[PDB]
């Protein structure tokens with residue numbers, strides 16, 4: 301398991317959490333020095349439990365699929381909650397079985413579906429450590445509309461930060477003040493699967509992407525990523541989605 305406590309949290313402690321999260325994901329291979337997530341894992345070992353505590357010390361446990369860093373569901377007190385999707389229903393066979401009741405959320409874990417449930421796109425939802433505190437608090441008691449926004453915050457401040465050093469740094473900058481994600485942040489989230497695939501295809505193509513990936517940079521300028529010498533590959537991305545899952 302991995303844990304993170306919002307009480308006393310600072311950029312350093314958050315960074316240790318994201319480091320713990322990355323280190324909890326198994327891999328047998330690195331591709332261009334980036335850990336390659338496994339094609340699959342059988343049984344309960346597929347799921348990592350993240351223990352998150354809000355500033356008041358209240359907690360939720362979030363189940364994460366270690367092959368793709370997808371959040372499946374979470375436990376709040378004696379109630380478990382899962383996305384309305386086959387992969388999450390499968391997870392519910394392994395985690396939080398001792399919950400007194402299980403609620404299936406009225407949406408899948410998809411960014412488009414969550415944004416629809418929340419009533420707003422990611423572009424408009426502030427993220428940061430305070431936002432994460434709020435998200436944990438929101439999830440403690442069922443409210444599906446509020447939860448959709450909370451989950452948009454949670455996915456970005458945990459999974460996405462684990463996947464991209466730039467996102468981790470963006471959250472550290474928001475340790476004491478929330479701010480909506482940069483367009484670069486949204487671009488990277490949207491491109492993780494694409495990037496993971498192209499980095500793997502580069503292996504037998506002399507480091508060259510079979511298909512360029514279009515990204516928005518820090519200055520808000522759209523760039524083409526064509527090979528593994530790009531900063532996005534050498535510094536930023538931290539985990540690769542296995543092509544067997546793409």
Ligand SMILES: *[C@@H]1O[C@H](CO)[C@@H](O[C@@H]2O[C@H](CO)[C@@H](O)[C@H](O)[C@H]2NC(C)=O)[C@H](O)[C@H]1NC(C)=O
Pocket residue numbers: 508526527528529530531
């Ligand atoms: C590999 O990717 C790098 C980008 O990081 C490409 O280099 C850039 O391309 C042009 C000049 O060729 C310039 O606009 C950029 O300033 C370059 N940046 C750097 C860091 O050199 C490079 O062209 C790509 N190589 C291949 C084989 O396509």
Ligand SMILES: OC[C@H]1O[C@H](O[C@H]2[C@H](O)[C@@H](O)[C@@H](O)O[C@@H]2CO)[C@H](O)[C@@H](O)[C@@H]1O
Pocket residue numbers: 369370371372383385387408409410411412455459
């Ligand atoms: O967990 C956040 C993650 O959600 C998305 O993945 C979904 C996917 O759409 C479903 O097919 C299934 O695998 O469940 C996942 C949700 O748990 C995206 O990958 C992305 O929006 C985001 O990182």
